[PDB]
Amino acid sequence: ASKLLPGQPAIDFEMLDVEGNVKHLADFKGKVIYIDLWATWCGPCIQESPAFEALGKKYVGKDIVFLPVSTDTTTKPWLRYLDGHKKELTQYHSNDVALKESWAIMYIPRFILIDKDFNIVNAYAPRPSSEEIGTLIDSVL
């Protein structure tokens, strides 16, 4: 569609933390938001996890949040996975219908970059291991 063009308002969705608190994407409004949509059985998604974590470490304390969002059909394999593989970033999970119907999340790995105005920078953002992601992030920070 065209509601995903750069400059278009980001579409809010809800997500759960590992403690079960519901959060909203809009809660992070005012910060650059880089989203990693992954699932526990997606090999290539997990291959981007070190880069995503490393980016999260590099930009710690800057006005950007890195949101790893599991799209696992159910919560339990997500929590079991996290139990055996430590991560540093705060982890989220979502089956919000808005992912499929507003963000057009048809395939993963999928990355999304949103600016401080809560507008889309790239709805199909470069992967965290790409050579250009840092430069892109710096441009919007």
Q: Where along the sequence are the contacts to a copy of itself (CB under 8 A)?
A: 5, 39, 41-44, 46-47, 50, 71, 73, 106-110, 123-124, 126, 129-132, 139
Pairing of strands 32-38, 120-122: unpaired
CB of 83 to Cl ion, least distance (A): 19
Stretch binding Cl ion (CB under 5 A), from 26-34, 66-74, 91-99, 106-114? 106-114
Q: How many CB atoms lie within 10 A of CB 57?
A: 11
Contact between 113 and 140 under an 8 Å Cβ cutoff? The reply is: yes
Nearer residue to a copy of itself within complex by CB, 20 or 84: 84
**106 belongs to the binding site for Cl ion (CB under 5 A):** yes
Pairing of strands 92-93, 64-70: parallel
State both tokens at 30: 């005012």
Residues that bind Cl ion (CB under 5 A): 105-107, 110
